[PDB]
Amino acid sequence: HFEPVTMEEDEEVLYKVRAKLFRFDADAKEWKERGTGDCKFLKNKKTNKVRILMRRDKTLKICANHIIAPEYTLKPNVGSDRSWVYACTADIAEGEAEAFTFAIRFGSKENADKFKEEFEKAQEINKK
Amino acid sequence: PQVQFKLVLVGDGGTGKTTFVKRHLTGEFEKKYVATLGVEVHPLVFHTNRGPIKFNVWDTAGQEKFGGLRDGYYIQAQCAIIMFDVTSRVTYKNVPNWHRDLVRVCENIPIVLCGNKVDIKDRKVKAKSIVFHRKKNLQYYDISAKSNYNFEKPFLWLARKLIGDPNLEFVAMPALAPPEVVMDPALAAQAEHDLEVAQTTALPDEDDDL
Amino acid sequence: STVDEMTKKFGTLTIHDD
Amino acid sequence: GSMEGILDFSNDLDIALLDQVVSTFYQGSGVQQKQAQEILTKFQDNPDAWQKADQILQFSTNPQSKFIALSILDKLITRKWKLLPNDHRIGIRNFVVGMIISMCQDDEVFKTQKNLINKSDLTLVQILKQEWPQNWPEFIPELIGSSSSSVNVCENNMIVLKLLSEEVFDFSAEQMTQAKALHLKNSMSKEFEQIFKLCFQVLEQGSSSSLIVATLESLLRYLHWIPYRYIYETNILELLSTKFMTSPDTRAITLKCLTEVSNLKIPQDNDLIKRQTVLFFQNTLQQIATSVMPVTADLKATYANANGNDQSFLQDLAMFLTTYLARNRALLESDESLRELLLNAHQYLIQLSKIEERELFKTTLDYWHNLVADLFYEPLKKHIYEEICSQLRLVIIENMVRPEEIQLYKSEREVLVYLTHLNVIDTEEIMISKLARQIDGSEWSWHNINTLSWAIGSISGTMSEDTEKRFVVTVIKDLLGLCEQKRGKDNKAVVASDIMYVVGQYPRFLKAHWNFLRTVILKLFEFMHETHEGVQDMACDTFIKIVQKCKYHFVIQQPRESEPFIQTIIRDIQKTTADLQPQQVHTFYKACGIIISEERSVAERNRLLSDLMQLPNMAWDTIVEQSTANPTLLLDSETVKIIANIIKTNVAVCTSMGADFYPQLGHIYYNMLQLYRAVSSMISAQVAAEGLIATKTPKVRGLRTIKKEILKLVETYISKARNLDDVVKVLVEPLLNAVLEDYMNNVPDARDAEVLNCMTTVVEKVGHMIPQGVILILQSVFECTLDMINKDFTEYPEHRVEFYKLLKVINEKSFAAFLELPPAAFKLFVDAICWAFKHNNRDVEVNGLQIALDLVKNIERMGNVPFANEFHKNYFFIFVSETFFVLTDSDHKSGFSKQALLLMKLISLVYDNKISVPLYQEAEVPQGTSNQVYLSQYLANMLSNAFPHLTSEQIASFLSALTKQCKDLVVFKGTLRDFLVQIKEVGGDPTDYLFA
Ligand SMILES: Nc1nc2c(ncn2[C@@H]2O[C@H](COP(=O)(O)OP(=O)(O)OP(=O)(O)O)[C@@H](O)[C@H]2O)c(=O)[nH]1
Ligand SMILES: [Cl-]
Ligand SMILES: [Mg+2]
Ligand code: NA
């Protein structure tokens, strides 16, 4: 005999799409980028609750972390055929729970429409 | 955290110092040039495999008339970034001057030289012209605060030198499970107001790939 | 013939397994 | 709170209030820190604050508050010093000198407050710049003497001398006048003998390393300017190359001194100096081998471990070796006793070249270029370096970079081409065996196969054709074999791409072997159907790449083929491009356009052109007929996409065919301009109905894309057009009618800047033939665009840039259009040019100044006529003063050269008496007076009001110099730079302007 010398483990990935997220600044009336990276829909294996988790490329810092609530409604944006905008009542990307008016843009209109389908799929799962 | 390092960020006015820092703080891209007056300090945390590392970023003024305390800002700095603009020959010509004033106060610190705005097609300061870093032992990166080309590299390099581990990597910060907040009608009035205004303000840069 | 035999092999280059 | 009390100067300054405000800044945070920041700023920028600095140096215990006090002193010394009474000057000198001596004698303070000592020393050097040696001849003797007493004062005197050398020789060019620089340089030069004795003495006899390091830091700076004799005719080379290379505290700095010694100005015909230059190199390499690491050490591993200052040291070593060897390697190549030294030093560079560090690699790569170039051309030199070059082949190949990193790749290719020529057999062998280690799987990875492919492709055209044939065949066979072996779509895609990459890099081989070329191209067509990421782009990029180089083999009829292969491509074009995205299709069509331009029979080229354009011409015709019968169809976004893509396919083919595109342009031209109008209507309609926000909507952007691609197609054709008569008679009038009025009559946010761009090209190519057309262009875009861009520097950036390009080309090619403007609009033209000067944006600034310069030249060329006389009466002094304003305001430094040239031209016009009328209104000055005399008075008056701190003597001297020197541009520029220094201070010497 010779002797020898992130908090996502519990979740299933339903949808994985590449996107850019914006937050609306009400005060100075304009849109501001919050991050660009993989947007992910994560179903918890314990609670069967689906969330959006989005991380920025390279630094991997969280720019979105909230439940896909059944109350939310994806509305279009006047300047885009590949974006949805919606009110979120509690996001914890920055740490402290806070409300936002988000927008989320994609590579194509087909990606955006698929996102909307998956977003509504996930909403139905969260009704239980 | 309490593992914290002071970083001075210097270079000519309009090179993109403040834009670069804001990108790292909030993720936004500021299109407007609003000149920094003297200095703004911004705490900036990265999550690494050797625990979190905080930079106290002293974003200084590049315009002569808004210089403020000038080299006063460099005292007890433990690292720095010198910034220029590859679309502007004069911002690279002034790099030796920013370095001179920086090292006279900070004799032995890691320093990164950054050529910003490499997204712009008509590049004026060519790659082969950029050699000032060699005899002064500065790390050099082409960067773009707009496209995020190499935007993490200056902070990753300084992190490695300050902690004294060349295998240090940025890693994914812990994603806590988000809350289950029920909305009340007392805050739905302002959410509905903000939402109607948000939909009718066009998102910026719609020709971009994302 | 060496160029011709290479050309023939080139013709059957693919990305698919089966 | 109570922090703002220190802004009250009616009271005595509370030092404890200062130190807490200073502490709140350097150790506090948030709202607290930000508030202290604005108070220290307002305290410092108070012009009285320097008087309260001697107080702080004595009474305060915070080094930061003292630092800030010296910064306030520094500002007074550089800017207001000569305005003080003589006693305040001496008083300040004394308590700066006294503070330095007292800080050096206190060992506690000398160790722990290094920032505050170095700042005091810098503040001393600023006094010397004002006061030495003319009012302080004993500074250098008194400095040398005081260095005997205390070893700490000796060390600090070396820091003072270092900084003095830096300020006089390294940073004086921008910051002081030419005359003051020369005075200070001569002064340092006069007393350097005495400075060098002290320096050499300390290096010989000293044992304190902190003293030795500081002395070597000063030596590094002296080496920039001192004569070579101080290095060669003393013992100092031995000391540097042996004694100081052994100890690690001194090593770092000594190595940098020897790097600069290697660059000293040296006589090249003295044998004793050649031996001394050999010796210090021999000694330096010897210390490295015995005290740091041997030749065999793995420097890649050491550098990556990053212990202490190893990375900086290895950087400095590379800089030393490359610098010395570039200049001196010839000295080591003849003597056989120096052969081991030569190859050892190069073997260290080989090991340094393996370090994973991009910028270091560039530095070593510049040296390898210099060497292998010399081995390619210089006789009997390559045999010496055969073992060095063989190792270098492997280093370059293993670190080869993609063609996308353009500068690095170009440098690597050049070096590798030279090394391939030097020994083709060795290069071939290394590449074949590297390929074998991908096949056996011991070095296999996506990155590793990619890098090898980029290297194998880089040496195309260096081998003989026969050797190349054998080599390519072997590489392709092996790579084809590699693909068959590998399992999975990811792996096979990576190898197929590399196969395709190498093939595209070897066009000579493709040209000689038609059967193979055909098979490759047919394979690329199969790959245009693959959905796997990146494959379709690869296939399209490779296709156009091959075509650019082998086009002639697509256009002729090859033996054993029924027709030229271009015909065969055009037949299956629908089936071939069916699965491509739109811009992939456009590249495909562009590639076909390259081929078709090779056919020199007009009838056949034109036939191929219409055959190629069959699909987009059929889709076009069914949309013209549809959408002209009912404009309703253009709101259908799907129809808008189809139309844009037709125009884009036309742009892409026009881009490769140029003048040959004309017949195809003719098929669509009139209907396309009608479409431009129908689309224009849609856009104005949606803006009225929905608001300015409509310009952001997908439907309006889609329509604007149609307009822009149409403008882009026309610009592209016209830019490359050979038959200008057809351009004028057929294309131009319909274009101006279609676009100009629509531009003028749209709201600002709906005006396409592409209109201006397109017109710039039209005026460039045929402006000389359409004078009434240029007039119509000005009228339609000039005033309405100027008003978009004359409220700030930020808004409408594209329009702003294209606007000044348009005026530039009009001013060159059709200046008569500016003559026909009514005086009110000509005044706006002048306003618009001066407005361009004030931009920071380089594209606008450079054209502003160039237009001004060309306008002045255009008026000179008119001679002695009423328009030239009236232009000078109205606008000469406007141009002189607006040019002066941007020269002197410190926010347009990027435009100095052009400003100086414009200013020189304006001044020269008066000096040569080329302005015939007087520049003054009658009876403002005496009646006989020359423009010369009145130019001097206007300028003297202008500068006295603009810079009231200048004396009349200063202003008059500057102007005599400037006007006398208006023939020699480089001297003129010097005089301007002297003025820019003197306006930053009070009491500048007027004699300074006699320098030249
Ligand atoms: N194209 C491009 N523009 C950039 C980039 N980074 C910054 N900018 C622009 O440059 C301008 C100046 O940016 P700032 O960060 O305000 O300049 P600064 O260096 O802080 O200047 P001072 O505060 O005066 O020293 C802004 O208009 C930015 O939009 C970049 O990476 N690419
Ligand atoms: Cl001494
Ligand atoms: Mg700023
Ligand atoms: Na290549």
Structure, explained:
The complex is a heterotetramer of chains A (128), B (210), C (18) and D (996). Chain A has 128 residues and is mainly beta. Chain A is 14% helix and 47% strand. Chain A has a single domain, classed as PH-domain like (Roll), CATH 2.30.29. Chain A is built from one helix and six strands; from the N terminus they run E-E-E-E-E-E-H. In chain A, strand 3 (50-55) and strand 4 (62-67) form a beta hairpin. Chain A starts with 10 loop residues before the first strand and ends with a helix. Chain B is built from six helices and six strands; from the N terminus they run βαβββααβαβαα. Chain B has a six-stranded mixed sheet with strand order 2-3-1-4-5-6, with helices on both faces. Chain B starts with a strand and ends in an 11-residue tail after the last helix. With 18 residues, chain C is mainly α. Chain C has one helix at 2-11. Chain D is mainly alpha-helical and 996 residues long. The radius of gyration of chain D is 37 Å and the shape is globular. Chain D starts with 14 loop residues before the first helix and ends in a 14-residue tail after the last helix. The chains are: A mainly beta (128), B alpha/beta (210), C mainly alpha (18), D mainly alpha (996). At the A-B interface, strand 1, strand 2, strand 3, strand 4 and strand 5 of A face helix 6 of B. The complex binds guanosine-5'-triphosphate, chloride ion, magnesium ion (MG) and sodium ion (NA). The site of sodium ion has 5 residues of chain D, from helix 25.
Counting DSSP E segments of at least 2 residues, the number of strands of chain C comes to: 0
Main pleated sheet of chain D? none
Largest interface by Cβ-Cβ < 8 Å: A-B, 55 and 39 residues
Total number of helices of chain C: 1
Major β-sheet annotation of chain C: none
**Multimerization status:** heterotetramer
The end-to-end distance of chain C, rounded to whole angstroms, is 29 Å
- Number of helical elements of chain D: 51
Cα radius of gyration of chain C in angstroms: 10 Å
Q: How many structurally independent domains of chain D?
A: 1
User: What is the SS-derived class of chain C?
Assistant: mainly alpha
Count of distinct strands of chain D? 0
Rough shape of chain D?
globular
Query: So what's the overall shape of chain C?
Result: rod-shaped
User: What fraction of residues of chain C sit in β-strands?
Assistant: under 5%
Structural class of chain D: mainly alpha
Q: What is the radius of gyration of chain D computed over CA atoms, rounded to a whole number of angstroms?
A: 37 Å
Bound molecules: guanosine-5'-triphosphate, chloride ion, magnesium ion, sodium ion
Instruction: State the distance separating the first and last CA atoms of chain D.
Output: 57 Å
Helical content class of chain D: over 70%
Cofactor (chain B): Mg(2+)
Modified residues (N6-succinyllysine) (chain B): 153
Binding site for GTP (chain B): 12-19, 30-36, 62, 116-119, 144-146
Region (Switch-I) (chain B): 31-39
